[PDB]
Design a protein around this ligand. Sequence first.
Ligand SMILES: CCCCCCCCCCCCO[C@@H]1O[C@H](CO)[C@@H](O[C@H]2O[C@H](CO)[C@@H](O)[C@H](O)[C@H]2O)[C@H](O)[C@H]1O
Ligand SMILES: CCCCCCCCCCCCO[C@@H]1O[C@H](CO)[C@@H](O[C@H]2O[C@H](CO)[C@@H](O)[C@H](O)[C@H]2O)[C@H](O)[C@H]1O
Lengths: 48, 1044
Amino acid sequence: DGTMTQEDISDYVAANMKDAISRTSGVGDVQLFGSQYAMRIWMNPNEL
Amino acid sequence: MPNFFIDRPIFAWVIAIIIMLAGGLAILKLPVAQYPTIAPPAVTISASYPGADAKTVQDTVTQVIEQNMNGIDNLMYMSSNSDSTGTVQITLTFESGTDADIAQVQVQNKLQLAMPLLPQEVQQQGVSVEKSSSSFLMVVGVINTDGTMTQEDISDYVAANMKDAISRTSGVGDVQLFGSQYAMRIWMNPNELNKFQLTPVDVITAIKAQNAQVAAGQLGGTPPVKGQQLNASIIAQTRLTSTEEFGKILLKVNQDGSRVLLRDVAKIELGGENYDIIAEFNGQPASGLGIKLATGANALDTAAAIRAELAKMEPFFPSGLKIVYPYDTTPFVKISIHEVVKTLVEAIILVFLVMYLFLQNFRATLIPTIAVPVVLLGTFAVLAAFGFSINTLTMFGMVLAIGLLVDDAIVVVENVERVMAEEGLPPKEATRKSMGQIQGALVGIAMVLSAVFVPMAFFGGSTGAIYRQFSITIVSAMALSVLVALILTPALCATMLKPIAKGDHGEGKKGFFGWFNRMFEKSTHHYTDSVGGILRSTGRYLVLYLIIVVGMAYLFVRLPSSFLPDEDQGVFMTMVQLPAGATQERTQKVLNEVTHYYLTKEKNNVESVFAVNGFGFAGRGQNTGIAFVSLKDWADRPGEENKVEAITMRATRAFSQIKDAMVFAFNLPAIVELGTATGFDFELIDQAGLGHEKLTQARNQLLAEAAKHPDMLTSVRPNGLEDTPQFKIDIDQEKAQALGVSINDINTTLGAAWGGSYVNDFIDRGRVKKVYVMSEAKYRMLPDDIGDWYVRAADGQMVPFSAFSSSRWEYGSPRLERYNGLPSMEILGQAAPGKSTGEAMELMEQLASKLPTGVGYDWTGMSYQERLSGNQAPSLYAISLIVVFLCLAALYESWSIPFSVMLVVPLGVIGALLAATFRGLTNDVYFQVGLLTTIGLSAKNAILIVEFAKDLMDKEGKGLIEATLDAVRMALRPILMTSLAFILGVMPLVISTGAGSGAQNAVGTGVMGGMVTATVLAIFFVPVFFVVVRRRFSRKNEDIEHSH
Ligand SMILES: CCCCCCCCCCCCO[C@@H]1O[C@H](CO)[C@@H](O[C@H]2O[C@H](CO)[C@@H](O)[C@H](O)[C@H]2O)[C@H](O)[C@H]1O
Ligand SMILES: CCCCCCCCCCCCO[C@@H]1O[C@H](CO)[C@@H](O[C@H]2O[C@H](CO)[C@@H](O)[C@H](O)[C@H]2O)[C@H](O)[C@H]1O
């Protein structure tokens, strides 16, 4: 429904789904096809 | 075999002696325990963050470790607490049968990934991973009987001299010190610090520099110059060892050259690493070690190892120091088992006595008497082969097997007896003939009877090992019983029985016993025509049976059910929980009242009280405590009023008067990890990052709605703590930069002073110990004290905290819970009276579904345990019933005749239900194993009636009704032998008082009542069962008198 971008969906599963799926019965490794959100500080060398 | 050993009596004995030797050895080596291990393994991660509040702990430590917990085999769930003591505990619970070594290995491999990510101070406190039970195995207490050592002295002696060796002992999963090791305590004074323009940063820097152990190499060290003749270690700074040495640490040298020493800005003493835990033994200063049993370890063995380690310490005790034993769960295991050994012996002697009453001959009753211990000792040897343990269920199997065993021995003796007593063969050929015609039956009937036990060897899950060990014991016994009946018993009849000849059973040559026979004689006829009159009956004697059956199913459903009964273990615990915010002093006030109560109002019952301030079931805190109560021996506490249930109820009622505290005494459940059996263990979950305040609100809503359903839910309560006032201080970053004060100096000053700081190590009497820096108590009690602390700016100025900060009161949590990596609150509760727990759980899930958005829930602990499909008895009893019918079909070569044996089943069940009902017992484990026993022996009685009736119709060719009669009690006398000897044999169980009598009383009255009814009733109904079945299932060209 157009509300969540791709970056958004990735954060949602990383933050709310992955950890429990990864403790679920018989689950070995779990690979996220995406990345969890971090606080992103994008620097500007000119303003610095 | 029977013939081979008849001609070889000594070979027979040799086999019996090897069997007994093997059993005897097993008894000396098998583990001993209350139950088979049914507890799921649980690995615990513990860490500490000195001075940290709960949210700091949770967000800086707990969340980090949890996010790293993945790819761990067999993990059922994970929970954790983070509290304002600075402490974390994360518990990972595994499926039953997980190898606890591997679980621990897998957990720690993940933890090691998280470690570099943890704060430096958490790492240096040491984080630990343990595999142990959650309850205490025992508490080893230590006092000083000359009062020449204080609480603190004792605690340090314990930590420094006893704890490590107890911690390294195999089977010891975890050890809690009730007290604290000494540390070098540097108690700072902010007045003097500021006087000399110093901060806690300077104090820390100086200690690290002047309490140092430096590596300085060697004179003439390798590689050396040629011709070197000297080589020696160079020794520089070494760790400081005394308060004097710390006192003279040089902070700085003034302008006029005067010296500022550490002792000029601080009081310096030995003192605990912490001051939270204070323990008393009967009101007297104490320390102790709370010991937890490692996953799967044997409790009795580990207790022994601990005792042995303790004994090695004692001679080197300082004067007055003494070990006391305030709380040990272990003697109850040893004593309760030995008490079952005592009733087992008594059962044998009582069987021997009833043997002798009927079979008057001493050598004839000595034969079954000999069989019993050969079979039972062999059975122990089998248990060993199967890796089982000597426990309550295997021991009960031994006792309950006796009826079955005795029957095999008597059937041989009696057949031989009344082969001699109806022809005239010497005992050697008399037994050969006799064995020739019963050995098939013997083997056969045992297979039919093992079928009533074998299916129940296959229960599943945690309840499963309980019935498996009982079932394998009985079936093992029954097997060996048949073995012995084919090997030893024929041999003993062939060599120990006296010849007879002449159609003999003799009335006149003894006194009392000759009378007994003569009564039984026409008692037998007064019985025979009783049957003959109830054979011309059939009509409404059938109807009575269907009344017993409906009365049986009626009595059944009325009877409540449970798993295992509470036992008086001679010990218990009292929990003390005050509101968060409560001071240590107030928790001591409450502990004093609890101690007082046991010391003065339970003099007859309570032997000692070991009370601990600052420790509770949920973990450390100023507002929590615990009392370990040891009781006087069971023999000095006669009657229900002096047992743990009435004692703890009385005590909880007294303590309910206590103001602003949660105080209650409770018996620890039979097994623990299964819970009191009306109780549910509920988890409320933040599923959408709602946060702690909103979660609290949803918890409150759930609790309120639950409260207005007392008809279904009772005692539904939060298991955690309530929010409390906290002091929020804001560092103003701008002012700090402006004044030139560094944030690291500010935070180290704030935290070192009010929280304490583990600086480095020093050496105390040869032992490495810690060094702590902290404000002296009087400068960290009041909010205004905050501004008395000063930090030094870059430009050398002293700036008071008040210049760069502001503060306010707010509310926060002192204990943050998480379940499966998500923020949670654990809610406890029980089903209301007359309601099932499942019904309470339902209502709970319904109540929970109407909770705000993003709030989920889960079941854990005991509630998890039984959602795990826990009701298999019916289908298993139905399978067992089916295999019994099939086996019986094989025995008689008929599809219909087995019915005449199987109709006996309700006749024994009605007795058990009635007995359990009238003694207010429950449908539990000891009720189910007891009834299979009764059904087994009631079956065996009925089988040998019908066995005779059929063989008199086929071999003799006699008519139906008339061969029933002859059949009917050619076997009464053996059936009354069998049954009455068993009934008087389980009697030590029913009249059992003392340790474990709860289980003995339980298992005993079920069997006794069942067997009493099973046999008095069947002896009139088995004659009926046979004839009614034989008519409904035709053959219209016999009845009346064949021969051939
Ligand atoms: C009718 C015959 C069958 C009935 C008899 C069965 C009784 C079973 C109950 C025994 C309970 C087990 O109790 C067990 O006893 C033996 C003997 O003390 C102990 O054995 C201990 O002492 C003996 C010497 O006395 C040593 O050989 C042994 O090294 C030592 O461990 C075991 O450590 C203990 O665990
Ligand atoms: C071959 C002859 C055999 C014929 C015998 C037929 C009569 C039936 C025998 C007794 C019936 C079994 O009794 C049954 O025990 C099971 C297993 O503990 C109980 O099950 C209950 O026990 C405990 C306590 O609540 C829980 O651990 C379990 O989750 C629960 O379901 C049932 O409430 C009860 O119905």
